[PDB]
Amino acid sequence: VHHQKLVFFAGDVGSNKGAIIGLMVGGVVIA
Amino acid sequence: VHHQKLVFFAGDVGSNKGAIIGLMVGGVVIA
Amino acid sequence: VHHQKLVFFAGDVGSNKGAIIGLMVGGVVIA
Amino acid sequence: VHHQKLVFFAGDVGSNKGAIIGLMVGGVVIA
Amino acid sequence: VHHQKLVFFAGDVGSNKGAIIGLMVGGVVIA
Amino acid sequence: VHHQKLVFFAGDVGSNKGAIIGLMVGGVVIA
């Protein structure tokens, strides 16, 4: 079992107002 | 079992107001 | 079981007003 | 020339991620 | 020339991540 | 020329992460 670089941004990101998540299994996220 | 670079952005991203997720298995995400 | 670099930003990030999360299993996040 | 209540929200608004504008005549808005 | 209450919110607003603007004539707004 | 209450919030506002502007004529706003 090997995970790596699940979400990757090679460039500039201007702004995040929402959610960014690698691995998600439970809980709650309201962005 | 090998995961890698599931979601990849080679350019500039201007803005995220929603969700970006690599692997998703459970839980809840409201963006 | 090996996790690494789940969410990766190779460039400049201007601003975060939301959530950024590597691994998520439980709890609650309101951004 | 009388203007009033051009945009009206009688209930609860959960979130705005775009533009809300009463009167618009010039300029530029991205949201 | 009478303006009044151009944008009106009678309920609770949860969050603004964009623009809210009453009268707009010039300039530039990103949000 | 009479302006009044251009943007009005009768309820509780949870959070502002963007712009809120009454009258706008020039300049630049990022938020």
Residue numbers in the entry:
A (entry chain A), B (entry chain A), C (entry chain A), D (entry chain B), E (entry chain B), F (entry chain B): 12 to 42
Report text from the authors:
The Arctic mutation, encoding E693G in the amyloid precursor protein (APP) gene [E22G in amyloid-β (Aβ)], causes dominantly inherited Alzheimer’s disease. In summary, we report the structures of Aβ filaments from a case of AD with the Arctic mutation and from mouse knock-in line AppNL−G−F. These findings have implications for our understanding of AD pathophysiology. Comparison of local conformations in this region revealed the presence of additional hydrogen bonds between adjacent Aβ molecules in mutant protofilaments; these hydrogen bonds cannot form in wild-type protofilaments, providing a plausible explanation for the increased fibrillogenesis of E22G Aβ. Mutation E22G may have an additional fibrillation-promoting effect, which is the relief of electrostatic repulsion as a result of removal of the negatively charged carboxylic group of E22; in the wild-type structure, E22 is trapped in close proximity to the carboxylic group of D23.
Apart from a lack of side chain density at G22, their structure is identical to type II Aβ42 filaments made of wild-type protein.
